[PDB]
């Protein structure tokens, strides 16, 4: 047994494109420190992938908001599940740096 990825396949699967990235909720909403969130992270379509030229970088072009359910664990008795929103990247692109 052995596996290979064809060059065209490597290029396409790793070219600049929206990929599922797990992001800790703190990074987006760094509010309410004395408040536990379960899960700690959320799965977000974030940009990523090779732009295959140093001059330009994989940047988002189309973005909108997704509200997801997170279990807000109160400092003491409380387990309310709240609808925390997050930003996601619908579309990415290869555009020049700055």
């Amino acid at each position, epitope marked *: 047994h052995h596996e290979v990825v064809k*060059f065209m*396949d490597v*290029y396409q699967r790793s*070219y600049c494109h929206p990929i599922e990235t797990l992001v800790d909720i703190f990074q987006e909403y760094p509010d309410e420190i004395e408040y536990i969130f379960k899960p700690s992270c959320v799965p977000l379509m974030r940009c990523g992938g090779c732009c295959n030229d140093e001059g330009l970088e994989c940047v988002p072009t189309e973005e909108s908001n997704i509200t997801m359910q997170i279990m807000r664990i109160k400092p003491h008795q409380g387990q309310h599940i709240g609808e925390m929103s997050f930003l996601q990247h619908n579309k990415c692109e290869c555009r020049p740096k700055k």
Partner: antibody
Amino acid sequence: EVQLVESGGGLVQPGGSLRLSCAASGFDLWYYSIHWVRQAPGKGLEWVAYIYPSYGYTYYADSVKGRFTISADTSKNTAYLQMNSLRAEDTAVYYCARHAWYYGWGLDYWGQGTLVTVSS
Amino acid sequence: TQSPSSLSASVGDRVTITCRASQAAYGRVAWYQQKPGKAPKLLIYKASELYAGVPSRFSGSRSGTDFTLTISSLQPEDFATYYCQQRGWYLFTFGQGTKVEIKR
């Protein structure tokens, strides 16, 4: 080894439907792009639509919006263009193509041409 | 638009078509070759890169909003109509088309 194979061409009276088929060999469609470009008799090219399976992208041209629908079945490695309220002007030969990033914004290996005629 | 609309040269003459991209779409232009009643083949991507197999006589350049396709040695095999594609997410803009006849 990459091939695109089309079928479904024929005649349809104005108001009718037809599904074109673009099957692919030697390369998975899922991580790629299938586009449809129609060429009217003696006229220029016209990008009809595209599908980007592993991306969830389905954008259509303005002339065909609503009337036509692009789709793809990963297992059969095959995209389909179901056109449903064909008017006369839609008569054209329809080509399908792959858009790979190694070749940038561009359509590598193309179809053969599947002819659709809208007349009563 | 494409320019010229139609043209006839002879064997060996270098020939260059120019395509307008008034919408500055980042040099996404490409060129395709349509032989008599056949499948459009691609010749130039990234407005200058060349597909594998495409003859070296084919090449492109860009004067800002003016992309040109250049054939160095027009040989009779290269008889076709050529199109330019501006591309872009949500954008195609196919060219007017340029018929390439040859004097014989």
